[PDB]
Design a protein around this ligand. Structure first.
Ligand SMILES: COCCn1ccc(Br)cc1=O
Ligand SMILES: COCCn1ccc(Br)cc1=O
Ligand SMILES: COCCn1ccc(Br)cc1=O
Ligand SMILES: COCCn1ccc(Br)cc1=O
Lengths: 301, 262
């Protein structure tokens, strides 16, 4: 890590996490525009946060065009700065600015294809992301979209062991987490990408629950209440309740009406109840939905 | 099923194989260390075994910690009075990386009998982070073992626990085990465990996965076999005590085989 804050010029604040603030900055020698994420250690009592230890350690290994690039780590006694490539916007902001036109299909398809490439690279390097949501997907002016915010991510072993429960922002959380399953795996990240796919088409969240049980109920009312046939094991899951209302599965044509047959096929395989049957990012890249895919620039400034 | 990541297990194994050579310590760092010995390191690792069992830490955490310690001591000369501080900061970092619920720093200060202050532990945390350049996602013996376990036909919990036990024994003794990669110690341990419990051998299927044969594993095997035989006499005993527990099927109580016929 060759950096030192003196070569950076702050430009504006661009956001904030539990971690602290993010600034856009400029490298005064090379010209490069970067995102600086500050982590406070003076205001830390437990030393370096585990969140930052995972983010830095895991992002150092993940060099891929659809994963935000950590360029550097400036590691004073007072402060820790993570230096990232700058990306101009997140997908949630872009969807809100695509309000009354929608995102054109070529762009949805390009974005979903890139996201799967990024996610497959993660999974191939034993990394679960565990917070895929539009706010955490960053877009540039050139048409790229990239996975970001790896503070909730985790290096897994094969087979997986029990990890932190109730990971993933609720609207994007997979049924197997909601039902308190002892184990979850790469399939939870696909579930989130499925929700994001649908959300790119409609511009609204697919399952906007207000509680764990409400989230489940919203899922069940769309995909049908799962039984042992669709999902062997489900009725034995720790937070499965036999009194769960038993909603019929609705035709996917009605879940996202504007989606074509290939789109529906792919979406359905991302949102399969059974984590073992849910499509992998690797296999999804071959889905016919992507036959005509291009990488066009975003249509908005 | 997806918990065994069928679509990524090979990519992952290949990647761990690349990463174990990068995260590998210097085989001969103890000679270049003036005030510390293999024997002092053995005492530290044995202690970290006890710390892990007291706080009910994952075994993966223990393995990571040893990885951090050995890499740190590969470039940083340390006085015997500070060896434990390194170890404590290593165990803290491993716990934050790997545990759902890491012990608090105060608990790490507590287990050192207030030999070190909180400020010392935190400062060392930063130093280890600087020395390792945050490269904490290191492959461990265990990450290879759990994959090897998927090749058992059928699965034997005594085989698995005994393999884990043997792999843990290897952490204690930098000589000879610094000279073997995690993937190879794991293979030796898996074969020795399997042979001891079921009489069977390193399977064809793991020859396909790893490229390792009993021929390429023989040197490590001969060492691990001696370590297993001598384990009741070793000065350090925390691992044997730990693997008497039923959690681990009491495998430390199994008798080692007298010969390998290998
Ligand atoms: C050029 O000034 C160097 C110091 N610096 C620069 C940028 C940010 Br963001 C914080 C900070 O402290
Ligand atoms: C989800 O991103 C929030 C924080 N962040 C992190 C990196 C970059 Br580049 C831009 C940015 O905004
Ligand atoms: C059909 O069963 C209702 C189950 N339920 C409802 C509300 C809450 Br809060 C928890 C919970 O489990
Ligand atoms: C177990 O061996 C006893 C020797 N010993 C004991 C404790 C500590 Br701390 C250092 C040390 O060298």
């Amino acid at each position: 890590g060759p950096g030192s804050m003196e070569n950076f010029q702050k430009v504006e604040k661009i956001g904030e996490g539990t971690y602290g603030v993010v600034y856009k900055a400029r490298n005064k020698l090379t010209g490069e525009v970067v995102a600086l994420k500050k982590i406070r250690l003076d205001t830390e009592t437990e030393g370096v946060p585990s969140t930052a230890i995972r983010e830095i350690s895991l992002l150092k290994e993940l060099n891929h065009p659809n994963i935000v690039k950590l360029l550097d780590v400036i590691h004073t006694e007072n402060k820790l700065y993570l230096v990232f490539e700058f990306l101009h916007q997140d997908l949630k902001k872009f969807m809100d600015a695509s309000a009354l036109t929608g995102i054109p299909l070529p762009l949805i398809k390009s974005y979903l294809f890139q996201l799967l490439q990024g996610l497959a690279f993660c999974h191939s390097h034993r990394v679960l992301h565990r917070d895929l949501k539009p706010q955490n997907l960053l877009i540039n002016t050139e048409g790229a979209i990239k996975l970001a915010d790896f503070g909730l991510a985790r290096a897994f072993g094969v087979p997986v062991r029990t990890y932190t429960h109730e990971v993933v922002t609720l609207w994007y959380r997979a049924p197997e987490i909601l039902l308190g399953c002892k184990y979850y795996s790469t399939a939870v990240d696909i579930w989130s990408l499925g929700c994001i796919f649908a959300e790119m088409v409609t511009r609204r969240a697919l399952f906007p629950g207000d509680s764990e049980i409400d989230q489940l109920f919203r899922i069940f009312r769309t995909l049908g209440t799962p039984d042992e046939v669709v999902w062997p094991g489900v009725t034995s899951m720790p937070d499965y309740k036999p009194s769960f209302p038993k909603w019929a599965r609705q035709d996917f044509s009605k879940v996202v009406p504007p989606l074509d047959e290939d789109g529906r096929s792919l979406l359905s395989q991302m949102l399969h109840y059974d984590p073992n049957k849910r499509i992998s990012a690797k296999a999804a890249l071959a889905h016919p939905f992507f036959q005509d895919v291009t990488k066009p620039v975003p249509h908005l400034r | 099923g997806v918990n065994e990541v069928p679509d990524y297990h090979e990519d992952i194994h290949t990647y761990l194989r690349e990463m174990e050579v990068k995260c590998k310590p210097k085989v001969g760092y103890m000679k270049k260390q003036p005030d510390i010995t293999n024997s002092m390191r053995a005492i530290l690792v044995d202690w970290l075994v006890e710390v892990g069992e007291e706080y009910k830490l994952q075994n993966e955490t223990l393995h990571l910690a040893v990885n951090y310690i050995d890499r740190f001591l590969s470039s940083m000369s340390v006085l015997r009075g500070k060896l434990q501080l390194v170890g404590t900061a290593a165990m803290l970092l491993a716990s934050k990386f790997e545990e759902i619920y890491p012990p608090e720093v105060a608990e790490f200060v507590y287990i050192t009998d207030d030999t070190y202050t909180k400020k010392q532990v935190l400062r060392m945390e930063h130093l280890v982070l600087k020395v390792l350049a945050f490269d904490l996602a290191a492959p461990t013996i265990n990450q290879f073992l759990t994959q090897y376990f998927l090749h058992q036909q059928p699965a034997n919990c005594k085989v698995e626990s005994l393999a884990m036990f043997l792999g843990e024994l290897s952490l204690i003794d930098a000589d000879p085990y610094l000279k073997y990669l995690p993937s190879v110690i794991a293979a030796a341990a898996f074969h020795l465990a399997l042979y001891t419990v079921t009489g069977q051998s390193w399977p064809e299927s793991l020859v396909q996965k790893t490229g390792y044969t009993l021929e390429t594993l023989k040197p490590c095997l001969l060492d691990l076999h001696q370590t297993y035989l001598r384990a009741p006499q070793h000065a350090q005993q925390s691992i044997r005590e730990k693997y008497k527990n039923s959690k681990y099927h009491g495998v430390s109580l199994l008798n080692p085989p007298e010969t390998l016929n290998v």
